[PDB]
Symmetry: C2
Subunit: 412 residues, 2 copies
């Protein structure tokens, strides 16, 4: 079986423009949730989000192409430039070498893509007619245009795949790239999950299905996975990126390896379109097959932990069942307190966070742990990071539609 | 390697509500393109589309669920019901047997999902403030959400969103999943319904759509000299894939066997296909090299735009060697329009039934030969010919390419 390793990583989110700054803030328990500025949310029932306030898209595209990409793609370009530079693959012109381009692809994930662009163009058309629809609307909004823009940026011509399984899209983007390399469809794959849906129809839409915290008075206290007073997730934006590479290719070129892919699991609840299944039965199966694939001792779990009542409860039950007992569950934390629930980007962001935690021996905390919930009784690494060396990490993603994805990376 | 066979199929489009009626109409060279009536297009620059005028949503959903499911999911439920019933796997409650449920998943593809639902809620928030639809109704992976609940299938639940290639990538990702032993069976469906103001307006503003509004049935004309853009269609195609031993063990009927696939990216331009169809060439080459069969029929991407049809024809010539070495080719997008993320699933069904029946459906509206598109496109009338393997191309926006090959059982 072909071995697969991680040779480059990057991310951007509401706590940092690169993975070093972002992980530091996350491990220190900071919080990037703020009052919404990107639109006028003053009359909305939810008025907070994990907005990135310091992102300049002209650093990653010329000001003429900025209008051709939705914000989620701009964030993807930032995170993937960071990861591709980190991998050392890029040549003197910051492109994949031409003789290697056909064997490196891209796997991109997003839950909704260019929501704000669809919104704005919907209103243009409604009010002023179809000739007011921007010529660049379609390219800016389609989810796979992450792969379109990034493949052109780096000159990578291998399989160009996209995942759109809602809150699990970023994890499925990793898994689909893994399958592709395992089956010899590529020797390297750029993986990126990216989401930016902080717009009226995005916030309004998740608020009307009652999925969002309405704790508007203290934004930094609103996202509190597994806490007794959790009352909904907080939308965040961001992108995470990883370079996956076949093992011999990485070692022969002397690339520094951050982790080795060890296992994955995929499942569907087939229960409810928005509520997770009682006992986390689908999450249990995805967790179980990843663990049986990897055959390693997981020392840290980055939970899905979106800070909703049912998700955090059912995930906690599934973790206890899959590991066999409360005491056998490794330390767990959700980092969605710090950077919010970034939807399709969550899995890619949290794979990066998990691998950095392993690399640094620092397990980031779940923040806002103020009232213990008797039904969520695991070790959630409350409020302060834990210094602990681990040899493998697990990352969970349990998304709308009952679609579940789990990945395990191990020390290399 | 684990072998994979097709044990059930279904489809709905602008020429039929099931695979038997639509393939017959497609093979006869009929055209489901019509004047747009699903919204007021009277002041639009494009006023034609492959609208399904006779679909009844209430057969596959309850009225409380139309708020929860965009039209593309409704079509997916129709096509997957047909396919799952066809497969014979369903028990007395139209569900997958509980003992097989954990090992059967779903792979769904769509390019844009519930565009019109997002549009409606965008307008409604703008006019009335912080809804007509649930944001759930529009997410592409809710195809897999609804269908997995519908049949009780609990295996990997995956979604593909590579624009015009989504339906073909949905097949391929299911194939990869079965090859790697992540599933023994997978329901595959591509579904698209984006015939709405902002959807027509978005493709019109990028100059991708035919403006031959006076003659709906003559507008979609792949490889013809007077083609001038694609025509939106809506629809859904569905396939049941099963590992070979699993299928024989339960006595499945076998329509075809998976033979090979190829995937590539142009990495050239966000909307313009690459010159010489260079990425399409590579995808086709890898599928042919994997499959090791003689392809007797190609269902082209053939969207009836100037550059797609030209560059696809060049790539075909380069991959097979010369004009006379290319197998018979047809695009069926004249008949049912370009169904975007659904096209690859629809066209896999069309291609497999072509093989089963020995009837190769035509490319229609072949009126003026284009000297640059000089292949055999099976013009206007279906050809009676037995084939042992079929290839289907999907070359989507963003330069993303997918090709799949199926061979005779
Ligand atoms: Rb996670
Ligand atoms: Rb095709």
């Amino acid at each position: 079986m072909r071995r697969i390793v991680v040779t480059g990583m990057g991310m951007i989110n509401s706590l940092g423009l690169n993975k070093e700054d972002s992980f530091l803030a996350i491990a220190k328990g900071e919080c990037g949730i703020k009052h919404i500025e990107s639109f006028d949310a003053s009359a909305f029932p939810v008025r907070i989000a994990g907005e990135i306030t310091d992102f300049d898209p002209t650093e990653v595209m010329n000001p003429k192409d900025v209008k051709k990409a939705g914000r989620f793609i701009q964030l993807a370009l930032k995170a993937t430039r960071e990861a591709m530079k980190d991998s050392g693959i890029l040549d003197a012109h910051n492109r994949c070498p031409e003789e290697l381009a056909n064997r490196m692809g891209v796997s991109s994930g997003s839950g909704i893509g260019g929501l704000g662009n669809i919104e704005a163009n919907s209103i243009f058309c409604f009010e002023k007619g179809p000739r007011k629809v921007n010529p660049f609307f379609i390219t800016s909004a389609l989810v796979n245009m992450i792969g379109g823009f990034t493949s052109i940026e780096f000159g990578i011509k291998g399989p160009n795949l996209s995942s759109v399984t809602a809150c699990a899209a970023g994890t499925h983007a990793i898994i689909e790239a893994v399958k592709t390399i395992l089956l010899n469809g590529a020797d390297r794959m750029l993986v990126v999950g990216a989401e930016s849906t902080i717009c009226p129809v995005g916030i309004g839409g998740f608020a009307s299905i009652k999925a969002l915290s309405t704790r508007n008075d203290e934004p930094k206290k609103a996202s509190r996975p597994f806490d007794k007073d959790r009352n909904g997730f907080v939308m965040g934006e961001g992108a995470g990126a990883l370079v996956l590479e076949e093992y011999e290719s990485a070692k022969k070129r002397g690339a520094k390896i951050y982790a080795e892919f060890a296992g994955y699991g995929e499942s569907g609840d087939a229960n409810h379109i928005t509520a997770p299944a009682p006992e986390g039965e689908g999450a249990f199966r995805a967790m179980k097959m990843a663990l049986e694939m990897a055959k390693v001792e997981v020392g840290y779990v980055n939970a899905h932990g979106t800070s909703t009542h049912y998700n955090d409860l059912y995930e906690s039950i599934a973790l206890k069942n899959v590991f066999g007992s409360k005491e056998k569950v490794p330390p767990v934390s959700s980092t969605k307190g710090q950077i919010g629930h970034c939807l399709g980007a969550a899995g890619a962001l949290e794979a990066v966070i998990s691998i950095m935690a392993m690399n640094q021996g620092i397990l980031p905390p779940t923040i806002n742990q103020e009232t213990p919930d008797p039904e969520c009784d695991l070790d959630y690494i409350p409020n302060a990071a834990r210094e602990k060396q681990v040899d493998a990490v697990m990352s969970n993603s349990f998304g709308f539609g009952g679609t579940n994805g789990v990945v395990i990376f191990k020390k290399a």
